[PDB]
Every structure is written in structure tokens, then in C-alpha cells.
Amino acid sequence: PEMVRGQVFDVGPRYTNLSYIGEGAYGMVCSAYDNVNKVRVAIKKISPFEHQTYCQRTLREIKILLRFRHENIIGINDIIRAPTIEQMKDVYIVQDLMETDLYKLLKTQHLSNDHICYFLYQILRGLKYIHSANVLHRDLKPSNLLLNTTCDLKICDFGLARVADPDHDHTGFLTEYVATRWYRAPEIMLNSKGYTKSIDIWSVGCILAEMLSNRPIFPGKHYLDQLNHILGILGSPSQEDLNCIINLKARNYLLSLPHKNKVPWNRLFPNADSKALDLLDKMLTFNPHKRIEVEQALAHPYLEQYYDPSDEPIAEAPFKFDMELDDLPKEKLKELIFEETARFQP
Ligand SMILES: O=C(CN1Cc2ccc(-c3nc(NC4CCOCC4)ncc3Cl)cc2C1=O)N1CCCc2ccccc2C1
């Protein structure tokens, strides 16, 4: 077998001429020549089976992405694994190879207003489909938005995605949370488990702000500092929005803060298009009940050049897990991953 940076990549016969791309907690990723479709592809080697949380992330990703089919969502093209559960130590997920991501692009490139508009349209078009399947992505951020050389955009990384569950969204103040700090809606720190679609709209608002200036809008250094960055720009919540926070720890924390006025978007973003700032304001609304929904955002005058609901498809039915995954042992999640990947075996 081929090796890459001290790692076997058992992907042949179909995939050859591997080049290292990167690695992280997930595993390792390469490009490889697909000898059936005659194109280079991404293959990520995942080795999740000794960690229940990595197994969860793997299974969520596979089940969701195999059900979804959308131009602005990364697909799974193939899955390689051993023929038996006993021999299965790794899973290789094959996906379309994308040249870069929005994180890399923002570190290195000024975006024209036309590019910002087109990226935002594609993010929302993909998100319309995700939300129409009653799924929440829950970790939208620049490094999960993949881009090719013609600026086509695909949402990736569904390892934290969940079925929406608004009736069980309430929690206490300062409840620990997994998704990337800088893109967390204020309510995560106050009273929310991140089980409603409004969580993803906030992250997209944050991404829009970051496209406007190439810098994260709310770069909190730790859990509560994230809330105080948000409040630093939005200002003190209104009495009405406060009255929606019934938990006394969260409410009394907010009441304890000195009054802060809203920082106007046009001072943070003096070169931004005024319609972009109107949409930004509506996505970065403190109260999640008043926050714009994905379909409303698509209909916003900023996106009028692109908006076409007949060409913004929805999922054919709501997505549903067979059983709850959060409590399952890692050995059971391995079995489920085995069954879920069976269709790619010859
Ligand atoms: O696969 C993941 C998370 N990742 C990791 C990754 C790497 C690469 C790509 C990717 N990149 C590119 N092109 C890059 C080239 C260079 O410029 C940047 C873009 N093209 C296609 C893909 Cl598909 C996508 C992903 C992705 O989705 N998980 C499932 C297993 C469970 C788990 C366990 C532990 C932690 C996270 C996860 C989530």
C-alpha cells in the first residue's frame, strides 16, 4: 500500500498517486487519482473506533451526507473499509476535491462585494436545503466552507450536525458547548443547547461579517468572553429580549452589566454595501426568535441578483436518525458505521 507522512492509505486499486493535504483530530486527508472517474479526489482516512465521540462524528457525517444531494453541500463519492467488522480499523471517505476553503481565502485575499454576495448566496442556498431536512449543521465557520478555482462553494463537516429539537432547546446559564467558540450565538452561553435553526443563522451572520473585513467579528478567548464580545457590538439587550430569558442566573448576569450602546454596522464596516449590512443586522439579532430564517435571508434585497426559489431546492423528506447516538457505546457505533458503509463494497 501507499504511505503518506508515516501512515498507510489502503485505498487501491481505484485510488493512486496520493499527495498529502493535511491532518487533524479527524485523521489525515490526501488527494488521490481516481482511476474510474479520471479525476483527483479528496480521501480522508478516519480512525475513530477507540473514541466514542469520534465514532459519533463519523456516523453523523456519513448518514447525513449519503442522504443529502445538493450543489452547495459536499457529497460522499465512495467509502473504503475492510470487508469485516473485525478487520475494520479505519474508514476512508472519498469526496470531491476542493482547492481551498474560506478560512484560507480570508487570511490571504480581499473579497470584492460581488464575491461576498455570491459566497453568501451559496452558503444560504445550501443551508436552505439542510434546514428543509430538519437538520442543523451546528459548526458553520470559514474552514467548513470549501471553494474551487471558480468560487463554487460547498458546506462540509457534518460531525456535529443534529436533527432540530426546539422543544428541548432550554438549558441553564454557562452550559458547556462543543461547536467553535467564535461562531456561537449569544443564547448558547445563556439558555440554549443549540437545537434550533437560528443557531446556524447566527454563524452565517458571523461569516458574513468576517467576509466584509477579513477578521472574525467576535473572537472570544474563552467561554464567557464570547458573550461579552457579542454584547460589545450589539449593546445591552432590550427589556423585551431580556424578558425572554426566564433563567434567573442568565437574566441577572445580563442585568449586572453596565449599559452598552449598539456599535453601528456602518462604523465597523465603512466600505460595506448598505444592503449587506441590513442583512447582517438581521442575522446577528440577539433574540433567536426575531433572527431572520434562511428562506427570508435568501429573499433579502442584498441577494436579489441571485434569488430564485425555484432553483433553491429542498430535501425530499425530513431527516431522522434510526435511534439516538449520544448514549450509544463506541462498539455499537462501529456496527452502525459498518452497516452504513456496506453499499460501497463491490
Ligand atoms: O471529516 C471530518 C472533518 N473534516 C476533515 C476534512 C478534511 C478535508 C476536507 C476536504 N478538503 C478539501 N480540500 C482542502 C484542500 C486544502 O485547502 C483546504 C480545503 N476538499 C475536500 C474535502 Cl472533503 C474535509 C474535511 C472534513 O469534513 N469529520 C468526520 C470524521 C469524524 C471527526 C472526528 C474528529 C474530528 C472531526 C471529525 C469530522
From Swiss-Prot:
EC number: 2.7.11.24
Phosphothreonine modifications at: 175, 180
Subcellular localization: Cytoplasm, Cytoskeleton, Spindle; Nucleus; Cytoplasm, Cytoskeleton, Microtubule organizing center, Centrosome; Cytoplasm
One Gene Ontology CC term in the entry: ficolin-1-rich granule lumen
Membrane-spanning ranges: none
Assembly mode: Binds both upstream activators and downstream substrates in multimolecular complexes. This interaction inhibits its tyrosine-kinase activity. Interacts with ADAM15, ARHGEF2, ARRB2, DAPK1 (via death domain), HSF4, IER3, IPO7, NISCH, SGK1, and isoform 1 of NEK2. Interacts (via phosphorylated form) with TPR (via C-terminal region and phosphorylated form); the interaction requires dimerization of MAPK1/ERK2 and increases following EGF stimulation. Interacts with MAP2K1. Interacts with DUSP6.
Record's protein name: Mitogen-activated protein kinase 1
Organism: Homo sapiens (Human)
Gene that specifies this protein: MAPK1
